[PDB]
């Protein structure tokens, strides 16, 4: 009878497994039409409509988190197992600059063995662009046995998380008060999870990754490198590489932290041997992060007369312009899972995009900057994940507004005041979007039409009307001057992208000053415009989710509904879901432009080879500066030019990329059937098909119905995203692996 958990709440039985739709009150009666099947999967994780108790929803969410973490652990275990058994990691360790990472071999069936490429190191397989080899090398993993043991540990951890989810749904489910301890949860997630994870990783780096990687960079082969445990039992194997361990932990406890400058450095730049960040800098960074997060975890009052109450902090932040201020926000975020999901997903996607930027900007792994496929894939993948997560955060903000928003509890607070002037916000955001689009894109079109008319001096180019990004160049200058002036204890700039020397590893450029000209001005304003339009769609969905001048009772129709009818001139897509659908489209557009800008700019003005005398030759040859300013330039010198490797991949080991290119084109075009058409035509065609089936006595008892309007839109957008992202995926991968 614990005060935090309920014991044996749900019986572990297979009876409900044999009753599909048991969770829903409407679906429990059984299918009558094929719409029931689709409704079954669309409501599976909508725990809000399955129970009327916040406690039950919270418990379901907790167990679902455990299942998701078990799935993630299984995926990581699979990655490590493939590295251990079906990879050339050992060969890549001895030749990182000449062996391509491969960790998946393809069975010899139907002639598909051509996919096993010549990745080097007496190996055949698919080249890997996830950068696991570089990460494992940065971890100090020098043998495939360690990868096998990490895979075994991942399997054990996945089983543990599965057992935890089962235990906390069926044997000991926490109570609502336990879930609502946001102060305790924040304290623990900030100190324990974040800070202690940073501290543990700093310890691992210092004791395992720092010596092993230093020996690897010195040229010591992985076979004669001591086993990682020997660096702990023997204080002399690590004190030779870093002659500060001879003093032990006495400098730490005597506040003489200057003695540890051997392995806790602040250098900046990149390791000249590997092209990645100095691992001493990384260890010092993780140590500082650990201390900062542990300190930050002692902020909120949990169980003693010590710390802050988030309710008292929010309620004190009022103002003349904001009425009641943040009063009621604590109740909103402690009684609505959707609001927490909105905030967490938005910040999580933004964090993913920031991670993507800082990855290529400052390569943190050895021999990852010179693996161009890995860098391109990591950036594009993380930016895509960030965009999807941001759209999801907007969607769940809209869901909270529709479902969990209480008008009485939010009288004259920030949420109320935002809804009260939603018109002004949306109208000014509309004006900003029109201004930004007009300018950015019409400058592009003006360049295109001036070039087409033979007026080269009328373009918005560097040798013409020039739009120099002076503000960004000022920041670039400030960073390259930071070491010794504003960061006096730095030896080198944080990233060579801001300026400095060309860093090359094995005649391949790792990082180099990224010059910003009029071409970068236009593409940056294109990014701003696309982001603003996506924000416009999502914010219009969130703010007008409850009511509008069209439908004053839109909240009574729910978050997900197709329309209110053909009246009022037509009330299609007025939902808030139909705004997360359009916003998904615009996020695809924005992220596609972002990754295109990254790919072309890097290939044209960063990546390449360096001659022995210091001459820099890039992959494309600097065509970004003069040919990325017109739409015809993007079509020809980027799309047409770099699509050559994809279309000429047939018969080679990259033929799978051409096949996926074609299939993604097919899927993207397939989406337009659902996006352009309507439900009535398909229902009436199914009518004649059903007539034929009845004529042959083969009409199913479950009456076949065309997909609902909302499901038709969802299928269309899912296929559109899959096709477009897969086309860009195949194009990028084939292009950057070939060259």
């Amino acid at each position: 009878k614990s005060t935090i958990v309920d014991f044996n709440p749900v019986e572990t039985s297979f009876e409900k497994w044999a009753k599909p739709g048991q969770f829903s009150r409407t679906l429990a009666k059984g299918p009558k039409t094929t719409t029931w099947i689709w409704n079954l999967h669309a409501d599976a994780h909508d725990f809000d409509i399955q129970t009327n108790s916040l406690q039950e929803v919270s418990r379901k969410i907790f167990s679902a988190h455990f299942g998701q973490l078990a799935v993630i652990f299984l995926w990581l275990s699979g990655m490590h197992f493939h590295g251990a058994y079906f990879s050339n990691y050992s060969a890549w360790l001895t030749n990182p600059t000449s062996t391509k990472p491969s960790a998946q071999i393809v069975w010899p069936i139907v002639g598909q063995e051509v996919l096993n490429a010549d990745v080097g190191g007496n190996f055949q397989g698919i080249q890997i662009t996830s950068g696991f080899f570089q990460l494992w090398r940065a971890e100090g993993i020098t043998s495939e046995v360690e990868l096998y043991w990490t895979a075994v540990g991942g399997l054990v951890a996945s089983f543990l998380m599965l057992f935890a989810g089962w235990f906390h749904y069926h044997k000991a489910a926490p109570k609502l008060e336990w879930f609502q301890n946001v102060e305790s949860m924040l304290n623990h997630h900030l100190a324990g999870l974040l800070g202690l994870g940073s501290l543990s990783w700093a310890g691992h780096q210092i004791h395992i990754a720092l010596p092993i990687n230093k020996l690897l960079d010195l040229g010591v082969s992985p076979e004669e490198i001591p086993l990682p445990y020997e660096f702990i039992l023997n204080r002399d194997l690590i004190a030779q590489l870093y002659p500060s361990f001879n003093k032990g932990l006495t400098p730490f406890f005597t506040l003489n932290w200057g003695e540890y400058s051997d392995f806790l450095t602040f250098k900046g730049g990149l390791n000249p041997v590997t092209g990645g960040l100095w691992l001493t800098d990384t260890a010092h960074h993780h140590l500082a992060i650990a201390v900062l997060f542990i300190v930050a975890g002692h902020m909120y009052k949990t169980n003693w007369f010590l710390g802050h109450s988030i309710k008292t902090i929010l309620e004190a932040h009022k103002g003349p312009f904001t009425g009641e201020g943040h009063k009621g926000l604590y109740e909103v975020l402690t009684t609505s899972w959707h609001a927490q999901l909105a905030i967490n997903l938005a910040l999580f996607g933004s964090l993913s995009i920031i991670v993507a930027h800082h990855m290529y900007a400052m390569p943190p792994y050895p021999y990852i900057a010179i693996d161009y496929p890995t860098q391109l894939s990591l950036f594009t993948h993380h930016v895509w994940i960030g965009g999807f997560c941001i759209v999801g955060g907007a969607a769940h903000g809209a869901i909270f507004f529709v479902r969990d928003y209480n008008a009485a509890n939010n009288y004259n607070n920030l949420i109320d005041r935002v809804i009260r002037h939603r018109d002004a916000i949306i109208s000014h955001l509309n004006w900003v979007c029109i201004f930004l689009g007009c300018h950015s894109f019409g400058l592009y079109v003006h360049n295109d039409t001036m070039r087409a008319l033979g007026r080269s001096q009328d373009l918005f180019s560097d040798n013409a009307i020039a739009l120099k990004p002076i503000f960004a160049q000022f920041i670039q200058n400030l960073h390259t001057l930071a070491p010794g002036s504003t960061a006096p204890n730095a030896l080198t700039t944080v990233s060579y992208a801001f300026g400095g020397d060309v860093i090359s590893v094995g005649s391949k450029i790792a990082m180099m000053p990224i010059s910003l000209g009029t071409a970068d001005f236009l593409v940056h304003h294109i990014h701003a415009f696309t982001i603003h339009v996506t924000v416009l769609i999502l914010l219009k969905g969130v703010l007008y989710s409850r009511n509008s001048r069209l439908i004053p009772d839109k909240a009574n129709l729910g978050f997900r509904f197709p329309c209110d009818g053909p009246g009022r001139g037509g009330t299609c897509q007025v939902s808030a879901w139909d705004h997360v659908f359009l916003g998904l489209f615009w996020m695809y557009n924005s992220i596609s432009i972002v990754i295109f800008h990254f790919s072309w700019k890097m290939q044209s003005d960063v990546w390449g080879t360096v001659s022995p005398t210091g001459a820099v030759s890039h992959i494309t040859g600097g065509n970004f500066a003069q040919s990325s300013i017109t739409i015809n330039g993007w079509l020809r010198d980027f799309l047409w030019s770099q699509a050559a490797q994809v279309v000429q991949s047939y018969g080679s080991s990259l033929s799978a990329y051409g096949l996926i290119f074609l299939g993604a084109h097919f899927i993207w075009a397939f989406s337009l059937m659902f996006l352009f058409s309507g439900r009535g035509y398909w229902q009436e065609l199914i009518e004649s098909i059903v007539w034929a089936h009845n004529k042959l006595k083969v009409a199913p008892s479950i009456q076949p119905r065309a997909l609902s309007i909302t499901q038709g839109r969802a299928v269309g957008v899912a296929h559109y995203l899959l096709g477009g992202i897969g086309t860009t995926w195949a194009f990028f991968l084939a292009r950057i692996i070939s060259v």
Partner: protein, 41 residues
């Protein structure tokens, strides 16, 4: 094992098992007799 066998009798599990078996015997026919453009007879 009365409701577990009923769960295995559901449409998704049965379709997954049948399609896995179908792809399996197709792939194995194509392994043991590969590159079959015409009827063997």
């Amino acid at each position: 094992m009365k409701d577990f066998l009923k769960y295995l009798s559901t449409a998704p599990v049965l379709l997954t098992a049948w399609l896995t078996f179908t792809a399996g015997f197709v792939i194995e026919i194509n392994r043991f007799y590969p590159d079959a453009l015409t009827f063997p007879f």
